[PDB]
Amino acid sequence: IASACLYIACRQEGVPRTFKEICAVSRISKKEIGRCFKLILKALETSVDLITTGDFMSRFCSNLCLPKQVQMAATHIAR
């Protein structure tokens, strides 16, 4: 539940983490996080905006050590 809540909080704040990224920092597997994530949304009667390719470009490119120009190109290409 905590792992799923952490995933939902990231989505609500506009900085989504992937289920795999949340699973890396949690002993709980991706499948169990995804299942609790669905239940928490139902229980809270809330929703999360759909993730877009641009929601991950800054973190993925910064972690890969890509310049800003390459990050902008990747953001445009995916969009």
Binding site: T18, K20, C23, A24, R27, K31, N63
Partner: protein, 222 residues
């Protein structure tokens, strides 16, 4: 004559030996030679009222070591050896003490500086990283330790509910080895579901309260 007895023939012979402390380089060179058969020659010069002791390093080994004697009246030093055959023996009694010192005054410190550098070579110290590490907590769908445990649980499978007669026969055979059994450990021997084991054990087995640790089950029907 016994294993613990120490041979004293050397002492009875009044054998005299010299105790000498030597630097590391002299010993290291001798170790490097591995005992070829010779490492140098010791020269002793005695004058009308003085004595001079010095050691000369082998020319081959290199590719003067003056000796300073010390008074022995401060201690009684004797050498004893432990043979590989478990026969301790007393080699003799130390009759003179000496110390080996280098001849070089300043250039010797250069060797020490390297030696100190060699001694400090394995002294690890923190390293600075140009970039922040990005290889930690890499995204993963399931942890490797978790899939292995999941696979092991699936492969082993859930414990099955066997017939009462077989469990009873196995249950009592266990009681033979040990008078008292813990429920948690007893489950492993029976390899049966906890609820099923308790139900069968409840009919015949009884719980005895022990204040030392806790209440456990009794496999004796009475």
């Amino acid at each position: 004559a016994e294993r613990g007895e120490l041979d004293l023939t050397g002492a009875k012979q009044n054998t005299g030996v010299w105790l000498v402390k030597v630097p590391k380089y002299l010993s290291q060179q001798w170790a490097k030679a591995s005992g070829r058969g010779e490492v140098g020659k010791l020269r002793i010069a005695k004058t009308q009222g003085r004595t001079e002791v010095s050691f000369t390093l082998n020319e081959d080994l290199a590719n003067e070591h003056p000796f300073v004697l010390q008074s022995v009246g401060g201690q009684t030093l004797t050498v004893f050896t432990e043979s590989s055959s478990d026969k301790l023996s007393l080699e003799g009694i130390v009759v003179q003490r000496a110390e080996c010192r280098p001849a070089a005054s300043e250039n010797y410190m250069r060797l020490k500086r390297l030696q100190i550098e060699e001694s400090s070579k394995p002294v690890r110290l923190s390293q600075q990283l140009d970039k922040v590490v990005t290889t930690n907590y890499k995204p993963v769908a399931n942890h490797q330790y978790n899939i292995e445990y999941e696979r092991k649980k699936k492969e082993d499978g859930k414990r099955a509910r066997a017939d009462k007669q077989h469990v009873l026969d196995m249950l009592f055979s266990a009681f033979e080895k040990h008078q008292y059994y813990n429920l948690k450990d007893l489950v492993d021997i029976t390899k049966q579901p906890v609820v099923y084991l308790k139900e069968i054990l409840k009919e015949i087995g009884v719980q005895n309260v022990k204040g030392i640790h806790k209440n456990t089950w009794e496999l004796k029907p009475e």
